[PDB]
Symmetry: D2
Subunit: 217 residues, 4 copies
């Protein structure tokens, strides 16, 4: 049911330090190549008073290239689909919770997202919009207590060229039982390709590739 | 505007590991003595599949006995009101965010609450309902970057007698500029007085007292 | 009852902070049942210390804590045999310390053999730049886990200019012999450098500590 | 230039885990430009070690990592003068270790002077019960903060029964002289105990490491 080319529709409702917003997205991706692009529009709550980058990794691991030797939990989840939940703990104490329930209808993934962020300091890089991009990252995928889990040590590049660190923990749950993978990794690169002044319109891109660990030789 | 006896109305909308719920609450307490009681009713999502104890400290620091020598941020915030936001990081990776916007009308406090919890392990004490109560605690209040903040190392007493740790960080913000206090403490005690089979109905009580720490 | 109203204290600390080796010796006195102690500390090697002396002070004995009759006193019951403790200190900018103290008793005098190691203090942070003023008073939570008496503290250093620098302490305490374990309780602390000379080569330190059950 | 295709390695570690003192000496060889090394390690003092040997193995030199031309190799450029590193290891059950290595080069041989201290390992946890099997392969994130080259790693020990035991590593690396600092990048690692005798008195260890830019 997952074709070489697929469409994507998304709705996020969220709050950051109490500021409510809604963002809608429409995009397309190549699940077997691990690439996807989305156009995102702020529907309610503009202008967003915080760094848009905190939202972008919340805007589907179906879009990750899996080699034959690693079970692909995500593609096997369909047609029923899966959901994930995530915590994001930034090093200055800003904390976010997020969830996405992902379904498939025809050739289009639907993503129903909730995002909430708290305790971002008023003069920190998130509330002052001082971020530039996420550095490329490697997600560690493992099974704990029967739950597929990804851990990432993420870093946002800041104005000035320093970094602002974030610990991600994501739990992934297929809607029916799926063959679980062994310990593995997924490399990611995410980029805002373009945006308008206050990020009311954003074009976003991600590439992701699963792999094993470094060999002995 | 804050009287010796006040009433409290609450609505909480939340999710825990994807499960939606709504809880409404009614009560009263006594502000200047720092005590409070609430009756809480589940409206949606019954039976709650998680330990009720994760919600109880989210169900107002107005209800805290403050001495003369520490400025009382919360009482001075009214009538205009205040809000707070909180992160709760449990030792097994369960993480909650929560927020309460508090306003007053006449003499009832209205509490509008959002609560979201993620990553609670399926066989941990929260999803297995193994919690007994929160241990008494001491919140540390300090100002950082102009924001009154409270830090707490919390512990839930478990079945079997062990403890399950949670680190709280709350930021408090008045709607109008209020005098900020110096570094201090607030002692807390919170109890579920009684419940029905699946905590559809709950009677809650908190006692809280502010202080400066030793020499005293 | 080998623990008397007036006790003497001797101490030797060997350690490292960001690779810098030092030795400090101390001689002091205390009142175990009043929960007070004072020590004179002298740098023997590693002068002048290139880091904030405050990071060391809580490492320079819970025998010196006033325990009320209703909470078992693990520390006083540890003697004559003694006890040891181990500690981690996790500062919010990523500086991390490990410390241990082996405590013995000869006549009226406690001997303390201490190791201390601190790593990853940022070169322009408050520790390596000596911006600290004092530790705020604190409350340690005492509990038993995996059969080990453990103390957790959320500590804060007051900084020049009025901010705070936070540190998470976890201490494990082990009597040489089986000693009755207390239930969950608290110890309030206050620690002060009373005086010091230029480079903290000579320091006089004081601590006051009192155990309690909390609210009530 | 001073670093050849084949180099020898000598090592001495002095340490203490939960108060237990030990000394281990190593001798080995490696291929710095291929990113590989092997060492034989012998317990000299403190046998039989009462904790999981796997906690020591990543302490037993980033010279042995293959660096592509487009990423500056801080470690090889540190020689002949050398470099040192400090590390914290925070295990998910509260065990915390600090470690340091001062690395020098004499002729064709690296010398490593190591200190290791661990505290607060639970008596029934996988370290004290020796239930660890191996470290999973990892990716170290290298970045420069405050002008200090730092590596962050989210490490995991595979356990008997198939679970994992997580450890957060932070290492800071400091050349003796000023060396060109690299941009943000990654180092993949694989470390394996190739063999060992009873109680790990004699151990052969292997590591492979490669630096890269990650995706694309």
């Amino acid at each position: 049911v997952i074709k070489s080319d697929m469409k994507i529709k998304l709705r996020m409702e969220g709050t950051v330090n109490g500021h409510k917003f809604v963002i809608e997205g429409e995009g397309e991706g190549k699940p077997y190549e691990g690439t996807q692009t989305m156009n995102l529009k702020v529907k309610e709550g503009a202008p967003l008073p915080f760094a848009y980058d905190i939202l972008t990794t919340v805007f589907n691991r179906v879009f990750a290239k899996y080699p034959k030797h690693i079970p692909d939990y995500f593609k096997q989840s369909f047609p029923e689909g899966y959901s994930w939940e995530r915590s994001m703990t930034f090093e200055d104490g800003g904390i976010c919770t997020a969830r996405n329930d992902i379904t498939l209808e025809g050739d289009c993934f639907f993503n129903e997202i909730r995002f909430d962020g708290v305790n971002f300091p008023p003069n920190g890089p998130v509330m002052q919009k001082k971020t530039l991009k996420w550095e490329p990252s490697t997600e560690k995928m493992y099974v704990r207590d029967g739950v597929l889990t990804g851990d990432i040590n993420m870093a946002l590049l800041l104005e000035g060229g320093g970094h602002y660190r974030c610990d991600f923990k994501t739990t992934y749950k297929a809607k029916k039982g799926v063959q679980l993978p062994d310990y593995h990794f997924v490399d990611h690169c995410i980029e805002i390709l373009s945006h308008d002044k206050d990020y009311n319109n954003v074009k976003l891109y991600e590439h992701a590739v699963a792999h094993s660990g470094l060999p002995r030789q």
